[PDB]
């Protein structure tokens, strides 16, 4: 530990997290509008400056450990759900959202955030623009698109485009009243998905950088991977697909420097 080297991708840009969290109109549980965020440095101070979360609980990572780690693919999914069923977005849970509106895969490494949104996402006549599904042919698969709303019949008699008893209307749209209790008030929710291995990061926290010193014992940090050791010039060839290597022992042994594309060893 003679020094402390930390190198992250040199690219920098304010992430579109601000416009993701501040959109004037969010999508429904009917269609989770998933938009890609990449090629920017991720800063969570704007998220903290945003409205106080009613429930910010995050899996596979901790909000303290959130800033240093570099995420490869971040995907902000937005939707509006009933305050009663806020706890249902957690994986391993069942509920109307879970059965038919949308699923979260059990092995989820991301953040879910919700905040009371009757402040401005409620109209006295109700926000019927937001809709949900009572009925579906089966259980919806995790992270699977569902954008079709065709007339469904519970009974054996086919509908043939005709609605009636045992053949209920396809989607139900809830109109939030300001008078509705906190349980029934609308909630704006944002869901983030992360991936940490075998991919280029292109999404990192603000940590600046310092050049490495070859053949010097350092406690390094590469793309959020914390390790200590001597950095040695290497001759083993890596294809563009893989960035950091692996040994028999399953710990890291090789890495390609983000700023200068060149493969380094992680020998002790």
């Amino acid at each position, epitope marked *: 530990p003679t020094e402390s080297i930390v190198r992250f991708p040199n690219i920098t840009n304010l992430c579109p997290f601000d416009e993701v969290f501040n959109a004037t109109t969010f999508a429904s549980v009917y269609a989770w509008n998933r938009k890609r965020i990449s090629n920017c440095v991720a800063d969570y101070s704007v998220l903290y400056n945003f409205a*106080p979360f009613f429930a910010f609980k995050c899996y596979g990572v901790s909000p303290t450990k959130l800033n240093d780690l570099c995420f490869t693919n971040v995907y902000a999914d937005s939707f509006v759900i009933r305050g009663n069923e806020v706890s249902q977005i957690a994986p391993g849970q069942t509920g109307n959202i879970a059965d038919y509106n949308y699923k979260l895969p059990d092995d989820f490494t991301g953040c879910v955030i919700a905040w*009371n949104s*009757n*402040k*401005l996402d*409620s*109209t*006295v*006549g*109700g926000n019927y623009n937001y809709r949900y599904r009572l009925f579906r042919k089966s259980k919806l698969k995790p992270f699977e698109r569902d954008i079709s709303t065709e007339i469904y019949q519970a009974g054996n008699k086919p509908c043939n485009g005709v609605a009636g008893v045992n053949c209920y209307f396809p989607l139900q749209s809830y109109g939030f*009243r*300001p*008078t*509705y*209790g*906190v*349980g029934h*008030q609308p909630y704006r929710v944002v869901v983030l998905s992360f991936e940490l291995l075998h991919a280029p990061a292109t999404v990192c926290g603000p940590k600046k950088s310092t050049n490495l010193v070859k053949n010097k014992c350092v406690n390094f940090n590469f793309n959020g991977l914390t390790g200590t050791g001597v950095l040695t010039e290497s001759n083993k060839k890596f294809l563009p697909f893989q960035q950091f290597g692996r040994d028999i022992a399953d710990t890291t042994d090789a890495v390609r420097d983000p700023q200068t594309l060149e493969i380094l060893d992680i020998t002790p």
Partner: antibody, heavy 116, light 107 residues
Framework: QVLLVQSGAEVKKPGASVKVSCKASGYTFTNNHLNWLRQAPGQGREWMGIIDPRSGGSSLAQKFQGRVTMTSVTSTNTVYMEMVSLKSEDTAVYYC?????????????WGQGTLV | VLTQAPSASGTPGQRATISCSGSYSNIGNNNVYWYQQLPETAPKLLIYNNDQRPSGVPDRFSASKSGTSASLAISGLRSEDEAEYFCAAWNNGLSGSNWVFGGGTQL
């Protein structure tokens, strides 16, 4: 100047239906909301509910939901209330309140009220 | 639910304040706005969005909130102007959400 029409004072009769109107002035009717709260002497103040001017929709407090009906009409520039099974306790003074959007919780004008 | 508020007696040429007592759901999260009233007179808006007075209200007055308590200060309160005041905050608690007004003690 913003002016709100006050319905005249009315005799209170148990088991009767009354209507009260508040006609807007000093502003365009549809742009800004109008909601209602009442005062009972010897007690605190309480809020009826809010009606949308442009859409005409009404949202009413659960505490007194169902006893009162509110309908907003463009030409009338006013909203009506209904009273079903008027009990002697419920008779009181009722104020109209005018404000902006829903998040603009602050009411910027006031109603004269009805008292006998 | 309603703010308890204290009781006051005016003293000429003296700054006076009115404080409200509410829950976290009543006043902590939702901003408050004040309403100065005099007998045989209609209500009047006093402060707007919990931090500033509306346009046209005299600038001598200042008000602020500290959690459950919001202090409405009157610059050199006069006994003739002195009257009971009352908070006006939005409540959203359990199955019910509504505007809650805590009538202060008679002044």
């Amino acid at each position: 100047q913003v002016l709100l029409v006050q319905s005249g004072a009315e005799v209170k009769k148990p088991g009767a239906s009354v209507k009260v109107s508040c006609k807007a002035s000093g502003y365009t009717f549809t742009n800004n909301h109008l909601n209602w709260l009442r005062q009972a002497p010897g007690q605190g103040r309480e809020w009826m509910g809010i009606i949308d001017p442009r859409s005409g929709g009404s949202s009413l407090a659960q505490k007194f939901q169902g006893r009162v009906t509110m309908t907003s009409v463009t030409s009338t520039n006013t909203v009506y209330m209904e009273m079903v099974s008027l009990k002697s306790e419920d008779t009181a003074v009722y104020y109209c309140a005018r404000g902006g959007s829903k998040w603009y919780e602050g009411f910027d004008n006031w109603g004269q009220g009805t008292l006998v | 639910v309603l703010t308890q508020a204290p009781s006051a007696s005016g003293t000429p040429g003296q700054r006076a304040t009115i404080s409200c007592s509410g829950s976290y759901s009543n006043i902590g999260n939702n901003n408050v706005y004040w309403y100065q009233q005099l007998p045989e007179t209609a209500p009047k808006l006093l402060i707007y969005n919990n931090d500033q007075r509306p346009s046209g209200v005299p600038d001598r007055f200042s008000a602020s909130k500290s959690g459950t308590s919001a202090s409405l200060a009157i610059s050199g309160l006069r006994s003739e102007d002195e009257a009971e005041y009352f908070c006006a905050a939005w409540n959203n608690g359990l199955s019910g959400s509504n505007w809650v007004f805590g009538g202060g003690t008679q002044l």
